[PDB]
Amino acid sequence: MDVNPTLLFLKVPAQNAISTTFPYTGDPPYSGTGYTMDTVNRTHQYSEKGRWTTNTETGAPQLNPIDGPLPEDNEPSGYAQTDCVLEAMAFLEESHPGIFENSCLETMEVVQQTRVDKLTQGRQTYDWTLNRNQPAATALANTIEVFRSNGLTANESGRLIDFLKDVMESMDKEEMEITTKQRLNKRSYLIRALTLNTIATPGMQIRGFVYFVETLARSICEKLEQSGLPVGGNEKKAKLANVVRKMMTNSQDTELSFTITGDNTKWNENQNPRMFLAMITYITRNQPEWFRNVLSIAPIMFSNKMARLGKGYMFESKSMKLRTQIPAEMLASIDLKYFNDSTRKKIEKIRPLLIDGTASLSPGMMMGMFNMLSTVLGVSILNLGQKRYTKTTYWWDGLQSSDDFALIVNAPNHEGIQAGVDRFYRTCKLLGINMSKKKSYINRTGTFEFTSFFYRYGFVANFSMELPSFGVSGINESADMSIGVTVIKNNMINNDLGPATAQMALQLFIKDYRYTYRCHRGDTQIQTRRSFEIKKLWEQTRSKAGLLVSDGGPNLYNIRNLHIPEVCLKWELMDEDYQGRLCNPLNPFVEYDAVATTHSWIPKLEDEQMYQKCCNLFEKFFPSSSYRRPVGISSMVEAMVSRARIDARIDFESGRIKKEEFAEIMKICSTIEELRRQ
Amino acid sequence: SFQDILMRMSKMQLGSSSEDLNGIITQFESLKLYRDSLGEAVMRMGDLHSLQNRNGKWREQLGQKFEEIRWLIEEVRHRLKITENSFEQITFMQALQLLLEVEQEIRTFSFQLI
Amino acid sequence: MEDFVRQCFNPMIVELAEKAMKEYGEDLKIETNKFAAICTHLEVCFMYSDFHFINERGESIIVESGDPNALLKHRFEIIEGRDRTMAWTVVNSICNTTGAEKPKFLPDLYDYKENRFIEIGVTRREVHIYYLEKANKIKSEKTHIHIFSFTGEEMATKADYTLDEESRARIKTRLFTIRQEMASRGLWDSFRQSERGEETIEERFEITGTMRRLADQSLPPNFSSLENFRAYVDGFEPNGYIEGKLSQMSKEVNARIEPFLKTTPRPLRLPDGPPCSQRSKFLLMDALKLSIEDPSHEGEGIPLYDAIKCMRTFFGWKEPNVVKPHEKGINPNYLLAWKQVLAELQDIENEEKIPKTKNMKKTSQLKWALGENMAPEKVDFDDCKDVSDLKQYDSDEPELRSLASWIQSEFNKACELTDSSWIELDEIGEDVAPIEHIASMRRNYFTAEVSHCRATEYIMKGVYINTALLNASCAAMDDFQLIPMISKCRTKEGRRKTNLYGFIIKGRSHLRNDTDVVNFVSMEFSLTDPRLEPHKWEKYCVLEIGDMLLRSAIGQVSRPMFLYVRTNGTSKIKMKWGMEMRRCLLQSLQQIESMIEAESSVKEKDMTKEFFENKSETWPIGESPKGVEEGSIGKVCRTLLAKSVFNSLYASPQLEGFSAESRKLLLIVQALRDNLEPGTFDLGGLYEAIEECLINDPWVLLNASWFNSFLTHALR
Amino acid sequence: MERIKELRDLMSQSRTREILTKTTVDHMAIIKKYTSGRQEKNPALRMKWMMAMKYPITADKRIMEMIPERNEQGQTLWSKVMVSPLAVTWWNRNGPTTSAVHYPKIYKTYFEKVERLKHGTFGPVHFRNQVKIRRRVDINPGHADLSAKEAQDVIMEVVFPNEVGARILTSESQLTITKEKKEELQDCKISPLMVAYMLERELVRKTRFLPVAGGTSSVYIEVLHLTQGTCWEQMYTPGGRGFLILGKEDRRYGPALSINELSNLAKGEKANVLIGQGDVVLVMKRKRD
């Protein structure tokens, strides 16, 4: 026969064996400026009927489709109506009284008591000082340096709000000097502050306002049952079960219930930041003006955002055998003869928007950033479905997220279901949400899908999590054994890893660990450089079940004891001699739980490490800094000098240290004081 | 190896109307039986109770089986060329490979015996 | 902040501060810092007057604890913890009694020992600075000014304190402890809240030029400034705008559900064109092995000596000839490279010291084969502009190719059992819990039905080859190193065995990024005549290198032995993807266990002994001309493993989208089969999305045919 | 001498001098987060490559006196310090031996899990379609008599006695838990940081939201990968001084002190001491109360 695995679904229902339709386990081995141009063109074409205005500050064309003509065809449209959005937000407030006030009150504390270091915790972010994607901490350090070079240092108080005050005050500066000495005028600094790079990272000057907005939106979503985004794991399946239980309690069973396994791919491009500004303005009514202002900055900067076209294009010759890269920065006047007929049209139709190497993108959003706020926007529609709003025999409810949405419509008959679905779709079009009528289907309630969670007659299969790597983490041979078992246990607890799958993942992890650290069991014959020592240790130990896997011992780990460290797992079986040798504190070599033993060894901006040196020095002076965050009003230098003096005097009087040492140390303290006084 | 191709051809014949396939299957079965008998004869070996009992007989059998195999490969090649189905293409390709292997093997054994 | 000021202070002071704010007209939830400042001031004022009394005679005592003796004055007057009117009345009464002078501003306490008023100030900034304005505001109106700091500092009028050391020290200790706690909780932002003397600001965040101007251009039309927009939003009620807009909306905007019936679906339209060709890194079903039974001595060893020993087991090399030319490169270079490989391997057996690695001589043959011929140079555009042929790198649509039958035969072979082991997994702790027993049963059955499988051979082959490539690329960044294709297995009767599949010649692997290509030449032994499916071997130059004597019961047959040679290229991400191919076993086990769990949730029992150990049960896992063919659970496990391996092996961006869209189509079909009355909104669009990624890939084009067969059989 | 020399070298420049003369001790956690980022492109492959070669590990110079330069078979164990994992195996094989009596006290939290699992009883496994409830479960049950703040002060009094801080140095009564922990860990040599981390794990309560269908005693949450699954439940029963701050450092009262030299100062006299992790403060034993 011809083997056809798909035919397996002729006997096993689709949901049961739907794990076979996901090809990869991890990122594939494959992956541009053309795509960015296409995205900009689509964003500006879905809203081409809006107003055109030239920004007075950034000097860029901008499209304003808000309150534009109502759509007259089933095509993506960005003409969100302000009154409709405000009405939906107001009705959401009405259904959950006190939600916005409570969320804002909770968020004020986070705004006031958030440190600048919180801005270092994420992914790579566009750095305007180097015009390049850099790690978050490096980008923040560079931004602080270039802010201090100019008369802008209020971030010297450990408050994110102060750093954002510096960010806002920087845009009034008529010059920005970058020393590495480049000089950026006001307009070129603005164009870089409002720039988004490439699936799109914002600068360091949009990424704190975004954090505050995300905190507020997360607080709001926590109180909305429809919002399935903030939760994750086995409590999303609870949401999928609760929605179906609420909707399928038909009394007299004369109400047809139909589930739309909705999809809305590419629905961010129709999000206009002006609608998010209106949402934030409504959410923050009757609140202190400073809170309203700080929360009303991220949409303001997103309405004037700029998109970098990327690396650029690259031509080639065959009569000369030469390759030439062409950056997108100069891709505004180049003759169009060189380009293919598709990229030709792209460049021709995007040229009016390009300025200073970037393309103006007023309408539309990008992945990430405003995920929670968009979830709130969708839950507004999902809440407008109650019978108190859809004043008809039909009604609907469901789940919303930043990726997928699932709807359930209950109506007395099929005509009612159709009317409800039409009303939902038209309201979504009104508020700028464009349902994808290409990947969405409707079927009687009882089976559906939501964010790779497949619900079938009460059983929910979770496939939204990639199977994690089950190899050594490569720290040492004591941390890896604990990290692998902790990873397996946490996947079992959270990502619904099966028992048999967990056991075989443990087997593969043990194989990889043994082959990496060359600690094959002591009774094997695998000849390696480390084999003689391990096989000699294996022969002198009477209890061979106490030996660690690192010492060629057996593997005692199973499902029932993944939470126990190996040293404590085997402690009762270890030899008294080998216990003492292994766990000898005076040895030359030195989230995961790990006992410290001889296996815990260590293997082989003008100064990027200047911040990481003072902290290490402080840890040397005050060890507790490595455990508890320090507290004190004195400067680091004063504390260090005092520690040195009181630690040298006592040592001198105790005999440990000499007298010349005393004099030299207390004079080095004096010179450190003199340097301070400069 | 003959079992796989024979089962595939049985599936072919049962899934459509193909009498030429029936003839090809019959010849394949005959060739498989001939190879089994030839292995049995090889079992009749150096031990000289009367080694080479049917030199002439093995000669007629070898000759006519040479013509039969030549015809079989030629027809299988034609069918593979004409056929456009995937199952049929795979079955015919396997049959052709097996036919070439067996024909060369019988040639080598004929060379050895003579 | 509220939790701090409620947990750190006694209820009396909290209530007094709440009353003070009620009288002053502020909200404690919002103005947390003002509340904390008031509580601190009240607490310090109370600690100022405590245990201090006036002796009956002209003397003062510091008797503490309960003092029911009476006859002793309190030595002080509490004025802060009182209403404005009551505080003023008390101040006037005491002033008249002692004939003092009514202060211009409200006092804080009144000293009895010395008949003067006293004002306490708890500053969060420089003590002398605070004292300057405290004295400037309070001119004349002789009143002692006593100022404490949150850092232990202190300052009093003319440095004339009105307390013993032990009480001022206690107040300073309390302030120091409060400061330390606020620092520990991060609440030490009240440092700046003292923007004015004896005042607590709200928290000023303002929008000014270049942000007010940017904020007046980022709001809906018909609005002039952000302030007008805020005013409009503040006054807004649901007058019914959604209903009116829906009424005005055109009826053409609708979501009409088109029923999805049994006859609506149509088979997917596959491309038509020249047949597709093999694209795997190494041969899969045509690979031939030169094997040596390594005399145990496990421990990896040096692969080059294993390859040499494998080569020395074969006699039969002949004069190489080109049986299938590449039709796109200089064919003689390929056989010249093969001859060079043979010559270098022979020379290795005539050197003083046996190498552990072999760097090949950069001959013109290997300089062309490995693409070492100068690739187009990196000129500048401003100098090469006038070349008359300068288009973009891609500048071309992909070629369309039709599905060929070779990929289906490859998959059929990938699901078959072999004679060797190909996998030896380590032990684990002995089962103690019933769930452990169930999991071990599942895992053991899967491994038994899968260890001796061809797909496992492919997994090991890819792991080994990619590991060798990565090591050579890292340690031989400038040499044309020879990298044998070696794998190791266990015959049925133990007897570990090392198999050589061919050779790889690596290029100049100066890989800085993870996406930089290293070129190489792969030359793999095979017994498959390239002239049976020439279209499959469109990227290979196939030579006839030798004759292999195979064993038959009748006798020794002599088959030809070809070498499939091709120039390929791989990057570090692809090497890691290959090295991580053991996860295919995990994925297949996950799929089987997910099916078992899904069927176990129904029937409320462990449905594990009915998948395995139930030989009667079978799953439809194939198609024959008569109909759908069944198979046992072991064959299902092997088929799922083969599918996972091929997905990891023919990975492409056309497979990721195809699977995603065909998943929705399959779910619609299942909803139809469940009598759930499915309906679509635009099925043609979904079909277009499925078909836009069926272009040239063999694996994706075979998956599309599989889906077509499933559609044909399911909706029947 | 080394650390003070490094401080002087760091303040020799101007940027690193301004980082030290401005940032108060309070704003150290913020400064410590300005790392570089992305220093591990492929840690597993790097670890494998490093183990492939010889002398991958780094050790102290003392190694040269404890472990012989060559193995019994002739394999080299260390070289000029760089060391091979053969040295680790040699140390675990026939190195110096000591007494492991403090480990069952420092790592008591981990050895309690082993004794709870060892004596646990396993019931039948039931396959059903139960629904999980998102409860607020205790991952680590802290000491009943100690809150989070009281436990942190116990830790900073037992592991870092000379950096307690003002609150822990003016409190009238010392908890008995601190006294017993000091007595138990008197001769401990494990590590200050590891001792502090294990004491935090033992004492500080930690709470978090889990979807648990069954018990939440925090003895059932450790075994949760084992007790509950996608569609099954496994029945399991687990086995079982006073000072007062006067102001800033005063030069008239002699040199500064540590917090361990206050035990012999006097009753009712003034002295300046280095408390917390910074500023020196003038204090006196509480003459009253």
PDB file of N, CA and C in Angstrom, chain C residues 179-202:
ATOM      1  N   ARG C 179      12.452  55.615  57.114  1.00  0.00           N
ATOM      2  CA  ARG C 179      13.151  55.832  55.854  1.00  0.00           C
ATOM      3  C   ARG C 179      13.717  54.527  55.312  1.00  0.00           C
ATOM      4  N   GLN C 180      14.312  53.708  56.182  1.00  0.00           N
ATOM      5  CA  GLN C 180      14.868  52.436  55.737  1.00  0.00           C
ATOM      6  C   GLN C 180      13.789  51.524  55.168  1.00  0.00           C
ATOM      7  N   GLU C 181      12.641  51.428  55.837  1.00  0.00           N
ATOM      8  CA  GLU C 181      11.539  50.621  55.325  1.00  0.00           C
ATOM      9  C   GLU C 181      10.995  51.134  54.001  1.00  0.00           C
ATOM     10  N   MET C 182      10.802  52.447  53.867  1.00  0.00           N
ATOM     11  CA  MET C 182      10.328  52.979  52.595  1.00  0.00           C
ATOM     12  C   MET C 182      11.334  52.702  51.485  1.00  0.00           C
ATOM     13  N   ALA C 183      12.629  52.798  51.790  1.00  0.00           N
ATOM     14  CA  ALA C 183      13.647  52.463  50.801  1.00  0.00           C
ATOM     15  C   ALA C 183      13.551  50.997  50.401  1.00  0.00           C
ATOM     16  N   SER C 184      13.386  50.113  51.386  1.00  0.00           N
ATOM     17  CA  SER C 184      13.292  48.686  51.100  1.00  0.00           C
ATOM     18  C   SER C 184      12.079  48.351  50.248  1.00  0.00           C
ATOM     19  N   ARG C 185      10.949  49.020  50.470  1.00  0.00           N
ATOM     20  CA  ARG C 185       9.757  48.772  49.669  1.00  0.00           C
ATOM     21  C   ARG C 185       9.711  49.585  48.384  1.00  0.00           C
ATOM     22  N   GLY C 186      10.701  50.436  48.137  1.00  0.00           N
ATOM     23  CA  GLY C 186      10.688  51.296  46.974  1.00  0.00           C
ATOM     24  C   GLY C 186       9.785  52.500  47.094  1.00  0.00           C
ATOM     25  N   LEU C 187       9.217  52.744  48.270  1.00  0.00           N
ATOM     26  CA  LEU C 187       8.309  53.856  48.503  1.00  0.00           C
ATOM     27  C   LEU C 187       9.038  55.149  48.832  1.00  0.00           C
ATOM     28  N   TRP C 188      10.364  55.163  48.752  1.00  0.00           N
ATOM     29  CA  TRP C 188      11.134  56.377  49.020  1.00  0.00           C
ATOM     30  C   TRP C 188      11.154  57.292  47.800  1.00  0.00           C
ATOM     31  N   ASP C 189       9.967  57.562  47.264  1.00  0.00           N
ATOM     32  CA  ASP C 189       9.766  58.590  46.254  1.00  0.00           C
ATOM     33  C   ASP C 189       9.183  59.858  46.851  1.00  0.00           C
ATOM     34  N   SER C 190       8.792  59.822  48.126  1.00  0.00           N
ATOM     35  CA  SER C 190       8.410  61.026  48.845  1.00  0.00           C
ATOM     36  C   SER C 190       9.595  61.945  49.102  1.00  0.00           C
ATOM     37  N   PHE C 191      10.791  61.578  48.640  1.00  0.00           N
ATOM     38  CA  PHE C 191      11.933  62.473  48.757  1.00  0.00           C
ATOM     39  C   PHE C 191      11.687  63.770  47.996  1.00  0.00           C
ATOM     40  N   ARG C 192      11.098  63.676  46.806  1.00  0.00           N
ATOM     41  CA  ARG C 192      10.845  64.832  45.956  1.00  0.00           C
ATOM     42  C   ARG C 192       9.455  65.413  46.144  1.00  0.00           C
ATOM     43  N   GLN C 193       8.547  64.679  46.788  1.00  0.00           N
ATOM     44  CA  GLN C 193       7.204  65.197  47.004  1.00  0.00           C
ATOM     45  C   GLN C 193       7.227  66.501  47.788  1.00  0.00           C
ATOM     46  N   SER C 194       8.281  66.736  48.569  1.00  0.00           N
ATOM     47  CA  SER C 194       8.421  67.985  49.305  1.00  0.00           C
ATOM     48  C   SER C 194       8.958  69.075  48.390  1.00  0.00           C
ATOM     49  N   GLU C 195       8.196  69.425  47.356  1.00  0.00           N
ATOM     50  CA  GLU C 195       8.596  70.467  46.421  1.00  0.00           C
ATOM     51  C   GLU C 195       8.459  71.861  47.013  1.00  0.00           C
ATOM     52  N   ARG C 196       7.670  72.015  48.073  1.00  0.00           N
ATOM     53  CA  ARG C 196       7.540  73.280  48.775  1.00  0.00           C
ATOM     54  C   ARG C 196       7.621  73.008  50.267  1.00  0.00           C
ATOM     55  N   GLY C 197       8.064  74.012  51.017  1.00  0.00           N
ATOM     56  CA  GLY C 197       8.129  73.885  52.458  1.00  0.00           C
ATOM     57  C   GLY C 197       6.774  73.584  53.063  1.00  0.00           C
ATOM     58  N   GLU C 198       6.695  72.521  53.862  1.00  0.00           N
ATOM     59  CA  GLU C 198       5.446  72.121  54.505  1.00  0.00           C
ATOM     60  C   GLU C 198       4.330  71.958  53.475  1.00  0.00           C
ATOM     61  N   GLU C 199       4.601  71.167  52.440  1.00  0.00           N
ATOM     62  CA  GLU C 199       3.615  70.909  51.402  1.00  0.00           C
ATOM     63  C   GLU C 199       3.959  69.602  50.707  1.00  0.00           C
ATOM     64  N   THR C 200       2.931  68.956  50.159  1.00  0.00           N
ATOM     65  CA  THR C 200       3.067  67.682  49.462  1.00  0.00           C
ATOM     66  C   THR C 200       2.382  67.802  48.108  1.00  0.00           C
ATOM     67  N   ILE C 201       3.174  67.886  47.041  1.00  0.00           N
ATOM     68  CA  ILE C 201       2.624  68.056  45.700  1.00  0.00           C
ATOM     69  C   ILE C 201       1.986  66.752  45.243  1.00  0.00           C
ATOM     70  N   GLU C 202       1.168  66.829  44.194  1.00  0.00           N
ATOM     71  CA  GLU C 202       0.462  65.673  43.656  1.00  0.00           C
ATOM     72  C   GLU C 202       1.383  64.711  42.918  1.00  0.00           C
TER      73      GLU C 202
END
